[PDB]
Design a protein around this ligand. Structure first.
Ligand SMILES: Nc1ncnc2c1ncn2[C@@H]1O[C@H](COP(=O)(O)OP(=O)(O)CP(=O)(O)O)[C@@H](O)[C@H]1O
Ligand SMILES: CC(=O)C1=C(O)N2[C@H](C1=O)[C@H]1c3c[nH]c4cccc(c34)C[C@H]1C2(C)C
Ligand SMILES: [K+]
Ligand SMILES: [Mg+2]
Ligand SMILES: [Mn+2]
Ligand SMILES: [Mn+2]
Length: 994
């Protein structure tokens, strides 16, 4: 059943053809269960660790290194009676890496806790119905409720389905709808039509929404919808639309996967063209068994050389460390990549209530009457400080602290605030904070009474649990509450009837203390309290007081105001009927006006300063709130989202006003406006979506169920530590201490991390370049591979491993938070930078093949000098006569390859220094800057020496140590790499773009 809010109750009843005093028949229920299904949200799984690892071995690139693992496996099985000893270390070091990279791939991409499950917390197991087969209410499984059911809800109930209210049995029905609005202040419901077809939830004052709860009262309704066709079901569906997105760089990775997986396919058929080049002269001396196997040997070496394995690890490590740094600021990152995604954020959307503000309603202004001089009426105004329910803060007069007990009118105000009140305050020993018990707007009065301390009660030595209600208790000892005239919609006030406690001195006679909406309470006042005296309420006085109250209600203030009054001479208890709320207004007449209090939900202290820092970093903050527009704009002004006099006509929108815009203007509104109010959970995700459709990287901050969709849609979702489980499990990061400042800190960390990543990804790739250049030089020319897989694997995973991780520890820049956010599209190399290490890569790729072949010809030991014969080793077995003065096995010596590797290891270790900075020469930026880079290379170096000098190591890696002349030759053929790039920096810091 649709549009239940605009139908009258008779139309809803007639639609299902049921009586409110009977309900559906059990047969009808059966038919509706068929037709509409059960009243429950579908669970959303998330692949077993099975289908996750499987998906790690799916993306093309990863297969390339599996190919060269199976091929490596075969070309290590049918290994001659020679060294089948360690031929399998290759197809295993590889087969091992792919294992490790998967387990890690999943340990960071997997979101443990499920936000749809948390949401089901709001689905009660049980609901109450009236069905035709019994007169009395029936308590059943909620999932068995169907459209058409007559349902009964009561105080403390979770509402089981979307329900048109038929009949309110209590005097009021007060509903907490925070899961759809973020607001915890009770909604007072009624049963009349809400004609607007486009009514937003905050307007549907005659509806009950599944998953909200009843803060008070009793009602009967008819179920309009169940299952996913409910408001909470829409939230469930937006969280189920699981886009499993990915970090900008993580999409760069996924991208480069496609990049590198073709570069290899091309280079392999390219090695094949130069392999088929001397296919026209094989002299068929070794058939093709030798040829089709020397070609796979090459593929495995190229594939291995191209893929920069170990990359996944240095990154994961970088991220994880980042996570550790943020945890120390009280930012709990739940997704490794996110720690860095925040860095490129350009727009931060934010819930207001409980996010930007404390979600703790606070009396911050009050007034009583000081003097009435005929027509003129002087008010005594005070402000009150503090922003939580904690009874911490002081009452100020002109900004200076005063003792509330000095003023008789305040004693009376406190008395009414304390007594005309169904709530209290409680100190939660487990969370370490004060919490309300009852309505927010009432607990604010409770808190006020504690701050006011009008009897100067000693409270400094109380436990926090006793302190919670101390000054309210002292007032209870003076006046005994005898009964309450509860709130009704017609009068918009409530009152409590009180007698002076036994042993008066207080003051003889019974009293009624009244609070309510100003206009109705003041209209029923005939007198005004001035100190302890009472004077007649006149028109001009009534008008001054109403005017000031109206200013408080619409200011830069926009406070909720209550007027406080007391009936000085109540009726006698016996003349009043308590069972009829319709009589209460009359009993609360002939009142004496006492004062007014104004409360708001105030900003957290750090928010303003954080917004400014964001602005300084080129980040926009947009408030998106379920709350009213007036309050929303006012809070925006207090926190510097808007100027205090800025005109915001087209900078602030309700969800409706936003919906009214042409679809084109909706997109543009999102770039211009910074406040969206009276919004539904969908509006928040829609705005995030628009933002993202300008390719803005966008964050969402929230604490509520109504933020869950936006939290899921944003590139980065951020939840408040003290907010809902649902919002937390929908996030990438949680601010455990609710400190908004931490977001600013997280951005910096993220920019720091982004800079170090991109360059250690360059350092690691410049490497994989030379290797390819080499595994291709020593392939096309027909030379004996200068390096083989098992060695490359060590280099890329370990030799370059440490140093890369060292670079992820370089110091962040000093202006890092004075730049605008980097563009999402920004590559990782451009023009100058690409050919930069295609030059450093052309050097490594060569200087390695060139120090291995050196050991042949112009080197001492030194088979050796063969020249054109060296590029022709295939015919040493066959065409031996050519090779006279040499053996036919010394073409497979460890020394030459140890020369090659020792060059790479030496070039890369150097290439790690020119990686410390992008442009700043080592001249102007010392190599002693990042000490950890030093310990990093000395480790890589001392590991290199190892696999050269340890009985096993050199056989598994095919190395044979180098003389001190074999190392002078290495250095004098490696170090120059520094001067090379070093001059590439001098030609970029001046004549390029600096
Ligand atoms: N228990 C209580 N005792 C006394 N006064 C109360 C009260 N609960 C609410 N009020 C006062 O009476 C008014 C009645 O609230 P009501 O149902 O009219 O909502 P609202 O006007 O705040 C709703 P909306 O934002 O959707 O238009 C409140 O604004 C408040 O001043
Ligand atoms: C088993 C497994 O999950 C993985 C792997 O096995 N790896 C990475 C990877 O994620 C591969 C990868 C995909 N996209 C990129 C970009 C840059 C670098 C890498 C990758 C490393 C790749 C490899 C093969 C080491
Ligand atoms: K997200
Ligand atoms: Mg909120
Ligand atoms: Mn992977
Ligand atoms: Mn109202």
């Amino acid at each position: 059943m649709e549009a239940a809010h605009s139908k009258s109750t008779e139309e809803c009843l007639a639609y299902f053809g049921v009586s409110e005093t009977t309900g559906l028949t059990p047969d009808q229920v059966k038919r509706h269960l068929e037709k509409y299904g059960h009243n429950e949200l579908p669970a959303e799984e998330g692949k077993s660790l099975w289908e996750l690892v499987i998906e790690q071995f799916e993306d093309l690139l990863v297969r390339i290194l599996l190919l060269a693992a199976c091929i490596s496996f075969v070309l290590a099985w049918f290994e001659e009676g020679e060294e089948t000893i360690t031929a399998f270390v290759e197809p295993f070091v590889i087969l091992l890496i792919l294992i490790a990279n998967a387990i890690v791939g999943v340990w960071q991409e997997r979101n443990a806790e499920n936000a749809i499950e948390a949401l089901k917390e709001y689905e009660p197991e049980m609901g109450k119905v009236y069905r035709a087969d019994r007169k009395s209410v029936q308590r059943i499984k909620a999932r068995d409720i169907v459209p058409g059911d007559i349902v009964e809800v009561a105080v403390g109930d979770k509402v089981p389905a979307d329900i048109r209210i038929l009949s309110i049995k209590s005097t009021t029905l007060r509903v907490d709808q925070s899961i759809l609005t973020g607001e915890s202040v009770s909604v007072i419901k009624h049963t009349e039509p809400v004609p607007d077809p486009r009514a937003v939830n905050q307007d549907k004052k005659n509806m009950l929404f599944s998953g909200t709860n009843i803060a008070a009262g009793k009602a009967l309704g008819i179920v309009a919808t169940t299952g996913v066709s409910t408001e909470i079901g829409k939230i469930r569906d937006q969280m189920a639309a699981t886009e499993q997105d990915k970090t900008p760089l993580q999409q760069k990775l996924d991208e480069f996967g496609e990049q590198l997986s073709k570069v290899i396919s091309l280079i392999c058929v390219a090695v094949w063209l130069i392999n088929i080049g001397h296919f026209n002269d094989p002299v068929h001396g070794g058939s093709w068994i030798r040829g089709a196997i020397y070609y796979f040997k090459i593929a495995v070496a190229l594939a291995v050389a191209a893929i920069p394995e170990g990359l996944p690890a240095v990154i994961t490590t970088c991220l994880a460390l980042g996570t550790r740094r943020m945890a120390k600021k009280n930012a709990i990152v739940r997704s490794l990549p996110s720690v860095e995604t925040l860095g490129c954020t350009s727009v931060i959307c934010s819930d207001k209530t409980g996010t930007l503000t404390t979600n703790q309603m606070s009396v911050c202004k009050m007034f009583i009457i000081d003097k009435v001089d005929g027509d003129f009426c002087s008010l005594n105004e005070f402000s009150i400080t503090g922003s939580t329910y904690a009874p911490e803060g002081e009452v100020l007069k002109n900004d200076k602290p005063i003792r509330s007990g000095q003023f008789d009118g305040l004693v009376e105000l406190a008395t009414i605030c304390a007594l005309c009140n169904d709530s209290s305050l409680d100190f939660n020993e487990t969370k370490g904070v004060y919490e309300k018990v009852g309505e927010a707007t009432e607990t604010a009065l409770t808190t006020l009474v504690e701050k006011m301390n009008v009897f100067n009660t000693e409270v400094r030595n109380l436990s926090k649990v006793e302190r919670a209600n101390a000054c309210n208790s002292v007032i209870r000892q003076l006046m005994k509450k005898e009964f309450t005239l509860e709130f009704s919609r017609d009068r918009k006030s409530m009152s409590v009837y009180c007698s002076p406690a036994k042993s008066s001195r207080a003051a003889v006679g019974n009293k009624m203390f009244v609070k309510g909406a100003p206009e109705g309470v003041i209209d029923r006042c005939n007198y005004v309290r001035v100190g302890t005296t009472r004077v007649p309420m006149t028109g001009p006085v009534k008008e001054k007081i109403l005017s000031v109250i109206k200013e408080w209600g619409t200011g830069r203030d926009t406070l909720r105001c209550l007027a406080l009054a007391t009936r000085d001479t109540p009726p006698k208890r016996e003349e009043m009927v308590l069972d009829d709320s319709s009589r209460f207004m009359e009993y609360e007449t002939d009142l004496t006006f006492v004062g007014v209090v104004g409360m708001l939900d105030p900003p957290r202290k750090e928010v303003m300063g954080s917004i400014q820092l964001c602005r300084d970093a080129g980040i926009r903050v947009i408030m998106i709130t379920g709350d009213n527009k007036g309050t929303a704009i006012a809070i925006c002004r207090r926190i510097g989202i808007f100027g205090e006099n800025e005109e915001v006509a087209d900078r602030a929108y309700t969800g409706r006003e936003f919906d009214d815009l042409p679809l084109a203007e909706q997109r543009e509104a999102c770039r211009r406006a910074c406040c969206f109010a009276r919004v539904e959970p969908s509006h928040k995700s829609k705005i995030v979506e628009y933002l993202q459709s300008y390719d803005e990287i966008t964050a969402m901050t929230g604490d509520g169920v109504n933020d869950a969709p936006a939290l899921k849609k944003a590139e980065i979702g951020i939840a408040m530590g003290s907010g809902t489980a649902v919002a937390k499990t929908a996030s990438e990061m949680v601010l455990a201490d609710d400190n908004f400042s931490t977001i600013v800190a997280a951005v910096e960390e993220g920019r720091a991390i982004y800079n170090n990543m991109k360059q250690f990804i360059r350092y690691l790739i410049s490497s994989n370049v030379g290797e390819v250049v080499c595994i291709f030089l020593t392939a096309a020319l027909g030379l004996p591979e200068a390096l083989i897989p098992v060695q490359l694997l060590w280099v890329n995973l370990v030799t370059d491993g440490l140093p890369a991780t060292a670079l992820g520890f370089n110091p962040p820049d000093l202006d890092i938070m004075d730049r605008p956010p980097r563009s999402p599209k920004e590559p990782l190399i451009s023009g100058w930078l690409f050919f930069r290490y295609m030059a450093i890569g052309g050097y490594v790729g060569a200087a390695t093949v060139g120090a291995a072949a050196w050991w042949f010809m112009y080197a001492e030991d030194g088979p050796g000098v063969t020249y054109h014969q060296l590029t022709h080793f295939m015919q040493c077995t066959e065409d031996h006569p050519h090779f006279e003065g040499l053996d036919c096995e010394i073409f497979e010596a460890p020394e030459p390859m140890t020369m090659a590797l020792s060059v790479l290891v030496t070039i890369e270790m150097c290439n790690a220094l020119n990686s410390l900075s992008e442009n700043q020469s080592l001249m102007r930026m010392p190599p002693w800057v990042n000490i950890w880079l030093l310990g990093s290379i000395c480790l890589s170096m001392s590991l290199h020496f190892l696999i050269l000098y340890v009985d096993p190591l050199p056989m598994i890696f095919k190395l044979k140590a180098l003389d001190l002349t074999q190392w002078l030759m290495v250095l004098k053929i490696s170090l120059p790499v520094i001067g090379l790039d070093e001059i590439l920096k001098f030609i970029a810091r001046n004549y390029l773009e600096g």
